C-alpha cells in the first residue's frame, strides 16, 4: 500500500485510541519504518525523518531496530514461537521471571505474565481481592487510591481512574465505587498522609488494596510526587493490613532514574505490576508480580485457583525480547545515562519557564514536562513538532517527552528546542 | 533457561500459570523446548520427545508453529518496524489487516478496534455497546444479556458473562456486575428456547445494551454445540427490541467451525464482533472489535464523546503483519475442504469411544472433537497417557478435546483421535 493508500484504509475503517472515529480534526500520520530514535513519517507525500520523542508511548527505550533485540525475537522464531502456558512452561518465561524477580523489589518473587498493562492491572486487583476472600475476610473487597491516577482501560482499570478528571470520568456511574484519597502533593506534607492513614483507618475492614503509580502519575497529568510518600503508605498498609500494589507500568525499568520508582523509597509494595518498557517496545507483554505470603494465601481457606490465563499468557517471542531488553539495560551504566538525560531535559526546558502560556516546567529522570496553561491545540503543535524533526504528542495541557535512552545529547537537545517551540505557540497564539 | 532442570527449578519457584494454585499443584508444567509444524518437543524423563499439538496451543496455532510464510511476514517487518505508537499515528500492517477482516466478516462489520488480548476486545465490545446507547440518550440500557455455558474472557466484565452456575468465575458472582442470563442454549432447534428467550428479553429491553454470546460452539464453558438458526432468532429479537448483538467469535473464527465465521452457519451479522485467537497464527497477542457503521458512528453522537480506549500497544505492526500473513494463507487455499476432511476424520477417529463406560457424549464441529465423560478428567493420569502416545491434549473439566491445526494431516488425525479413546479408557476405569 502507497502512504494514500494507507490513509484512505485507515479513514474508513480503523478506530484510533480514545477518538470519534470519523471526528477527529488531526488525521493519522503514516509511519513507514523506525530505526534507532528515529522513525520515518510520511508528510506532504515525503519521508521525513523524526524523533521518537515519545518512545512509542514509553515503551522504546532502547530506540527501534536494535540488533539485541532484534536477533532475540528472530532466535526465538526459529525454536518456538509459542506454546500454550496451560500445562507448559519454557526457556524464555523461566529467564524473564528469574530477571523480573532479582531486579525488583525485594519479596517480590511470583510472576504472573499477561498481555496486557490493563490487564496486569485487573490481574493485581483480583490477586488482593482473592487473598483476602483467602483469609476469610471477604469483606475486604474496595481499593483505595489518590486522585490524579491511571491505571489503564479495562473496566476495574477505569474504577481506580482519577474521577473528575480522568478520562474514564463519564463512567463514574457503572464503576466499582472505590475510596479516593485527595491529590497527592509534589512537596513532602506530613498533613497529608496524616490524613491519607485517618481515611483508610475509617475504610480498612472493606479495603482490600490501596493501589497507586509511585512517585510519577503520567497518564493523569505527569504530577511528581515526593518518595517519602511512598514510605508512609507502605507503613499505613502494613500497620492497618491493606495490602500495597504499586503500579509501575509506566515508571518501571529506569524510566525515573531509579530502576523501578518504588527503589526511590526504599519500598516493597505487596504487588507489583510492570508493561510498557518491558519489551522494550517490540511486543505486548505485562507482568503482575506478588510475594510468597499474597500468592499462597490467595489459594488459602476456600478461595481456590487464580482464575486468570491469558491465551497468550508468557508468550516466547514476547519473552524472549523483554529478556534481551532487561540484559540490555542492565549490562550498561543505565543510572548515569538517565543522570544525563535528565540534565539534558533540564538544560533544554529552561527557557519554556519564561514563556507566557507555560505554567510549570518539571524534569524527572528521563521524563520531561512543560505544562501550560491552557489545552495544547494538536492541530498546531504537530505540525509545529514535525516541521522540526519531531515527533510529539501532547494530551491535555501538557507538552512532554519520555525519549529513549539511546538518545544523544543532541537528540536531547534537538527534542527540548521543538517542546520550547510548540509552548512558544500555545501562547504565541492566534 | 537453559536446561530442563533448570527451567523446572525456576518455573516452580516464580511462574504462576493459569488458572491455578501455585504451589499445591498436583501436575507439574511440562517443559516446551522447541515447536515446528503440528508438532511439539517436550521433554519427558529428561529426553526431548516430539508430539502432536491437538490444542493447537488453545486454539490458535491453525498453520502450525513456524509456518515458513508466516515466519517471513514477522521478520519483514521487523526490518523495517517493529512498532509505534498508534495514537496520532498509521501504518500498513495495521491498514492491511483491517481492510481484510472487514471484507471476510459478517456483512456490515466495516470498523475495526485493534487490541491486545481477547478479553480486552470484549471489554471494548462492552464499551461500544454501552456508549452507543448513551449516544442515543439511553443511558438507562446498560445491562448485558447472554445464555449459560459461556465464556467470555478473565478481566472483571468479561468474568460478568460466565455462566455464574458453575462456569470458572463462579466464586465471584456477588462483586460482578449483574446480567441477564437465559438457559442454557440446547443442541438441536427447538423453536421454544428462542420464544422464552423473547420473552425474558422483552421484560429487560429498557434495561439492556446487547445480548452476547459465542455462536454455534460454547468453548471453555464446556464445549458444546447449538444449532445456528438460534443465532437467526437472536439477529431477529434483537432487531425487533432495539438491543445489540455481540458475538464473540475469539474461539470460532477463522474457520474452525467449518464456516469462516460462526455466525456464517446462520447468514447473520452481529452488530459488535471480537476476534482473536487464530488470528495471529498462535504467533503473538493480538485480537480485534469490529461494529457497524451505525455503532461507530453513533458511540460519538448524542455528545457521548471519544470511545476512551485505547491500549498502549494498539495494531502493534509485529503482531499485524503476521496476521495479515495467516489470514491471507488460510484464504489462498480451500480451507473449507481442508475443514471438512479435519471433521470427517475426528468423527471416524471418536466413534469408538462412544461405547466406553465413562463416556456420555462425542461430538464434532469442523476442526473441533470433543468426548465428554461423566467425571472429572485427572490431568495426572491423562496427561502421561497422551505423552506416551505422541500427543499432547489438555482436558478440562470432563472434557478430553481437540482442536488441530489445520494441517494435520490424516494419519496426524488418527494419532490424536487414538490418545484421545485412551484417555476416555482410562478415566472409566478409575
Ligand atoms: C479465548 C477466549 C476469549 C479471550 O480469552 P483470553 O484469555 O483473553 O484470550 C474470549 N472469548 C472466548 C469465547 C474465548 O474462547
Ligand atoms: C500504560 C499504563 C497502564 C496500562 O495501559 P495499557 O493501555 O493497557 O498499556 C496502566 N497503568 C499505568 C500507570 C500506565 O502508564
Ligand atoms: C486461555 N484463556 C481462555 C480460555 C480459558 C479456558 C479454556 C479451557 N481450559 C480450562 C483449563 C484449560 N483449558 C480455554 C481458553
Ligand atoms: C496507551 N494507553 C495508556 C495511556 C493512556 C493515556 C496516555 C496519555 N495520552 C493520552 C492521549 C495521548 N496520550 C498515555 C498512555
Known sequence: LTPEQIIAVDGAHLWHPYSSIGREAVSPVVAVAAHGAWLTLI????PIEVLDAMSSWWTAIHGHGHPALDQALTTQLRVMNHVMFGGLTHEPAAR???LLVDITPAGLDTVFF???????????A???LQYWRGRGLPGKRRLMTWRGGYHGDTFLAMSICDPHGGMHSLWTDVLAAQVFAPQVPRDYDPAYSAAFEAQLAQHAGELA???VEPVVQGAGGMRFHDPRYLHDLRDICRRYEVLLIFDEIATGFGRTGALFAADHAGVSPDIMCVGKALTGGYLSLAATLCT????????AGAAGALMHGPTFMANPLACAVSVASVELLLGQDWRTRITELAAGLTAGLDTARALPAVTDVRVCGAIGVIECDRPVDLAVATPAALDRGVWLRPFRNLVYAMPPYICTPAEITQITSAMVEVARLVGSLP
Open 96 to 98: 524473564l521471571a528469574k
Open 126 to 128: 483480583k490477586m488482593a
Open 43 to 46: 508528510r506532504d507525500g515525503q
Open 114 to 124: 499477561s498481555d496486557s498493562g490493563s490487564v496486569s492491572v485487573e490481574v493485581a
Open 209 to 211: 488494596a490501596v493501589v
Open 292 to 299: 510468597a505470603d499474597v500468592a499462597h494465601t490467595i489459594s
